[PDB]
Design a protein around this ligand. Sequence first.
Ligand code: RJO
Ligand code: RJO
Ligand code: CL
Lengths: 305, 298
Amino acid sequence: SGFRKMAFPSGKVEGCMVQVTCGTTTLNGLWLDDVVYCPRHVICTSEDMLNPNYEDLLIRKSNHNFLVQAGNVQLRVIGHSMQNCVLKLKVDTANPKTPKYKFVRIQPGQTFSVLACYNGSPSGVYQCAMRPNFTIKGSFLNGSCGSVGFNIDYDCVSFCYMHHMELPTGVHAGTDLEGNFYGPFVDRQTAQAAGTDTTITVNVLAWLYAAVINGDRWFLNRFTTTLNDFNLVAMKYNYEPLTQDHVDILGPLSAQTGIAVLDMCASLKELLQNGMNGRTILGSALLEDEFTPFDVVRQCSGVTF
Amino acid sequence: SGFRKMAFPSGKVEGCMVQVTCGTTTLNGLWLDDVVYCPRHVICPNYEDLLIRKSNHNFLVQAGNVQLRVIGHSMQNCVLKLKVDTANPKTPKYKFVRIQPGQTFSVLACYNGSPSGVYQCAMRPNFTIKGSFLNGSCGSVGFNIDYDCVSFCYMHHMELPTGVHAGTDLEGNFYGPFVDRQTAQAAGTDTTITVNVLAWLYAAVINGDRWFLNRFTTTLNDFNLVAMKYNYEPLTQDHVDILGPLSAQTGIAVLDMCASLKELLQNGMNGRTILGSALLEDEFTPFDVVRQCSGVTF
Ligand SMILES: CNC(=O)CN1C[C@@H](C(=O)Nc2cncc3ccc(F)cc23)c2cc(Cl)ccc2C1=O
Ligand SMILES: CNC(=O)CN1C[C@@H](C(=O)Nc2cncc3ccc(F)cc23)c2cc(Cl)ccc2C1=O
Ligand SMILES: [Cl-]
């Protein structure tokens, strides 16, 4: 019993965090095998950030301009290349702590753990989701750039995010580990703003099934809905449209609890209409959208209470 | 910017988790130096009588894919200490510390000696923790990190009928009036950790959420009468002193913030949120707020 926002154990990622310094800028790097991955904006000054020509800044650099520190040990940079918005520093030592890993690009609604780091040293771990507007609502201060997002299903670490910047509203933007940004963002200090955000509907439904599993049914009703009528209502509350893929994905949780997806969709419509009336669902007075159907199945029991 | 429920990096604890099996029971153990610590209920009660029957080879300890040989066993309160023939090469610098209600810690949830997740939680005033644990999680541990030293403060033992959890410090002393046996046990009426809600209100102000601030101030006496009415823990002068730095950083005196909290308790949030929450959050200590709004590393 219980339901917490749970992050993956961070040990396999801690053993990869390094500090990367180029001139006056210091940020975090990810050391896997003999390569250190970091945001390419480590080569920029704050002045350069408005309209930086990264190719022009990079050509002026040599290997010895990049200082890489792993713990109390200086790593020697023997090569460098840029791939999209990520800088790849070839080092002369393979990381003995390199876990089994993959680089995966995630879609909005997907969750991951973030190991927040400063000066190559990990300070904390939290769980979050890629918002529909491609931003993440993280907790990052200056010096956190290069901190990474990941999932660990089995013994393999799947790296999905690298932190690059904070937008004016306090939300965060970054790239996959191949340096492609999530969202229409650029690694420039130009006027950029997160688009209007929406609620991840398939995740709220999954979290309503988690409440049923843990023994709570106060929010259910005797109604059903068509998928189209559900979407016509939910879009009026800034909820993402629910697709047939989402309905298919919720199939296992529907079979475990005995509640059809479109019947759970009807409880959701009523919750949006009425509010909670002083009640909570899994200790929350808001509808939670940062748990995927996969997270609910992973954390919850196989036997409904 | 941003404010998340953040746990300490779990790597130093992951390197200590082992699987302990005795008969049909399998649970988690903490391997530090040449000793494995685990709940004594792995032998299940008259624990001294059940333990005397057991021999070293009855305890099967597995660290990864390696079997550890048990060479001795002893009981300390509700914790079993299994002497093994190999010191854990991954043993971090550590201490065993007992925490007080209101203090927070990270939990590394484990199954079959394998860590599955890490979350942050608080020791409730009724000594239970609102964790997320399934069957097989017994022996999972709670900890904090100060500099490079891991302070182990909790070991999981059981789930109560309301779905909340009970356990011991690493010396086997239970937190709360609980016993390690399947008997009629219930968590007492819980209260809200007032000093923690105040710290989280200061964190909201630091992050630009100021709608709840008002021109009023109050007294400890007046505020404590309000806190007692709303099932909030009493606020002591020690709590006020502890909130001193956050009060100096934001310019809001602790009794000035108490008047905001009093107004929130008597009138609610009015459709508004604070740090993305429609409830008053009490699982961040004043130290957690200062650490997360400063970026302290380990
Ligand atoms: C809020 N940002 C700024 O005032 C200056 N700024 C620096 C840098 C940037 O955002 N770093 C930060 C990252 N994450 C959390 C941050 C919290 C606070 C903070 F001051 C800086 C953070 C940056 C990188 C890129 Cl690729 C593009 C633009 C910028 C940029 O605008
Ligand atoms: C709810 N538990 C039970 O009905 C059986 N039960 C087994 C065991 C215990 O609580 N383990 C569990 C721990 N954490 C989450 C658990 C989720 C579900 C679960 F069935 C068992 C969990 C236990 C240990 C001690 Cl020291 C004393 C009493 C008991 C006990 O009563
Ligand atoms: Cl995905």
